[PDB]
């Protein structure tokens, strides 16, 4: 349902990582399957070749935490005006305090030791519910 269109119309874009995370670009192919692409170190940029109508989303390459591109979830390359390529500003979102805490706790304790932590069982289930691209893709389809 949520897939890239096979337009065959090239579109040059710059993937610019304005975040302290290693960014994993994710392209949704013509069947809606997510295809990973080479990662972006923090503060670095990449001038890449894409096509109009293609679907992109970006995430932390290590923990799959969601990220924002141009202050939204999905980036679609548009028409290049005067040969100027499109800018894809990849930034950190304002996480909830709950999710931000989960990120820090996930990065410190092994998933097998989630039960060994002294927390409410509801928080234990929230810790194991890792941010997954497949989970957000179903949610992104409203």
């Amino acid at each position: 349902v949520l897939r890239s269109v096979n337009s065959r119309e090239p579109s040059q874009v710059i993937f610019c990582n304005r975040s302290p995370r290693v960014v994993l670009p994710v392209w949704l192919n013509f069947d809606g399957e997510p295809q990973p692409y080479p990662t972006l170190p923090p503060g670095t940029g990449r001038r890449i070749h894409s096509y109009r109508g293609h679907l992109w989303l970006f995430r932390d390459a290590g923990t799959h935490d969601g990220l924002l591109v141009n202050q939204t979830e999905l980036f679609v390359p548009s028409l290049n005006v005067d040969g100027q390529p499109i800018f894809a500003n990849i930034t950190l979102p304002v996480y909830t305090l709950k999710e931000r805490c989960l990120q820090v706790v996930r990065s410190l304790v092994k998933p097998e030791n989630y039960r060994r932590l002294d927390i409410v069982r509801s928080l234990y289930e929230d810790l194991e519910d890792h941010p997954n691209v497949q989970k957000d893709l179903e949610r992104l389809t409203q």
Binding site: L108, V109, K110, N113, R116, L117, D118
Partner: protein, 104 residues
Amino acid sequence: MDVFLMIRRHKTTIFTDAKESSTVFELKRIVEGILKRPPDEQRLYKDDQLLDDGKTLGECGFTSQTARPQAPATVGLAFRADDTFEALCIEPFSSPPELPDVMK
């Protein structure tokens, strides 16, 4: 340019923001509206150093680089009991528990 501060005295902490170009006295007027004490009865500090009323917050080392929203700079406050001022006292926050073995 906005600076983000923690005005602290005893067990009181005021979270607020101000301009880098604003003065120490104008910050005392902010404390006045919150703690109901006039500026002539307050003394503001950066670490142990007394702050002059006419100097700007930026001149006293309060910049956007050092006074961020996620890590605000601390401004010490001392009140005047009748005739003489008190000494600058700031109650430290509670100590967190030791790191669990599962976290270490």
